Each structure stands twice: as C-alpha cells, then as structure tokens.
Ligand binder design. Structure first.
Ligand code: SF4
Length: 76
DNA sequence: AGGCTGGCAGCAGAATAACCGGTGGCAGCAGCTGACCACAACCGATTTTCTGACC
C-alpha cells in the first residue's frame, strides 16, 4: 500500500526523539511530504502527547513549541 | 429295574397440597479505610555556557 511512502516509519524510529535541537530538525521537516499530516497532527493535539515529533511539529508535555531550546545560557 | 446314548426338538444370539422452623447464602450499601494513581507543583543538583564586569 502507501506504507513505504509514509515518512514516519521510513527509517530508524529512534531518530525522532533525539534530544538535540538540530538532530530532530530534519525529522520535523521530513514530514513536510507526509500525506497524513492533518489526522496525525489532530490525533497528537487531542490526546496530548508529551514527546517527540508529531505531525511535522515538536511537542512539549502539552503543547507545541516552535524550536526546542538548547542546553546552555539562552541568547540575550 | 433304571441309565446314558442317540437323534429330535426348541431356543439364544449375530449380520445384513399446603404450614412452620431454622439456617446459611447473598446482594446492597454506608463506612472505616488504605494503598494508589495522579496531576501538579516544587525543588536539588547538574552541566553548559553565555553574561557581566575586572585591570
Ligand atoms: S508525525 Fe508527521 S510524518 Fe510522522 S506519521 Fe505523523 S503525520 Fe506522518
């Protein structure tokens, strides 16, 4: 079916929870071409997923952050 | 004098209406819990790593 075209499970699944701001960036933008962004993002927002890339967007424990804040002192 | 030998005959089996007492089960439910999620916050370093000034 359309399973190998689905960009979620094409490669290694441990990529999409890597705890670097730059590592998961290609994981987030790899769901640009995903055919099911609407329903996946809708399910992720309704069930309140606390981790990882969902619907081509990252998640905190309840909501969506724009980009994950890096380790260290943030920029003034 | 009967007996035990002989067929002869006959048969089983197989195939193709109430009471009373008591006693234990049981289900329903307030009412101690008491362990348990469970959010939800709040801190305890921890490490990085800028940020800010020092001379
Ligand atoms: S997170 Fe995005 S890319 Fe991955 S399966 Fe869901 S919609 Fe597709």
């Amino acid at each position: 079916q359309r399973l190998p075209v689905l960009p979620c499970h094409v490669g290694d699944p441990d990529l999409w929870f890597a705890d670097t701001p730059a590592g998961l960036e290609v994981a987030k933008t790899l769901c640009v071409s995903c055919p099911i962004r609407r329903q996946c993002l809708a399910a992720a927002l309704q069930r309140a997923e606390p981790w990882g890339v969902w619907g081509g967007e990252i998640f905190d424990q309840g909501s969506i952050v724009s980009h994950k804040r890096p380790r260290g002192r943030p920029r003034k």
